[PDB]
Amino acid sequence: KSLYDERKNALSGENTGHMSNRKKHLIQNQIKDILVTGISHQRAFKKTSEFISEKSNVWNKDCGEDQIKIFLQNCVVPRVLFSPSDALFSSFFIFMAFRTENLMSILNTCITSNILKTLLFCCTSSEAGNLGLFFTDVLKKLEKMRLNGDFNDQASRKLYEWHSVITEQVIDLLSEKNYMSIRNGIEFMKHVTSVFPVVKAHIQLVYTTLEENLINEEREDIKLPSSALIGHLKARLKDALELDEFCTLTEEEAEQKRIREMELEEIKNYETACQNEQKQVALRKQLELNKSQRLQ
């Protein structure tokens, strides 16, 4: 309803004066023409909302894992790889038709199954760009219901676990061969970079991988989006990012946090004063070390 009202704010705020009678005749004809359209679109939405609500009760009486796999590939995926206005439908349908427990079980097999490095290999520049518009509207609806809406801590562990497998799928895609894997992964990362920042660490995983393919080889002029994605990736590094307020299950990662606290407290007095000289390895060098530990 909000985009209907601001259209009326355009004509009322811009045109304030005497220019002609025919020009102000046609505007007041249109200010009622939008309102008859909005209440009929409301009645069209009212016709479908109680229709989908009375349908979904006998729909969400049976949940399947193999009965949902054929739905995800023969009814969901070809309507994402078709059109950008049509890929917005495939996200709006899952968050409206299925219920809350059904929604998580659908998005389970979509992400943990490593197919996202395989779809983005065999697409076009537009088909790969429409796949990114799917996961933009999925993660935007998940981040809004985690901030405003409340979750249990066991569910919020599963939400941040999906972010761990998303970032390790795209990095394996970028380290592949010449052109088809690299160019699609850039355009896929162009749209999902809006709601990226869930964890400070995961931004630095996807950032330095663009530097590994930058120094060694330059086949075509693909350094230009690589520097452009770098300028967008680090632009959200400084807002609010810490995995220790929300993810609280820390049985060992608290210990590797507790070691890293004593390395920074030792080195902050080493840069202030000088009593016993001891050198350590910096962040990005040891942040380069755990890449090849996971790349193998």
């Binding site: 023969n74 995926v77 779809l119 065999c122």
Partner: protein, 42 residues
Amino acid sequence: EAAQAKWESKISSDEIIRQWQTLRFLRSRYLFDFDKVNEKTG
């Protein structure tokens, strides 16, 4: 099914761009397996 009959014959016994055109055909029904069933995804 002939593309899988082409597939099941060679397992019993460029091409990566020939792999690019097969994977635009096999994403119709046999999509959710895609680990190592046809080839090495590399």
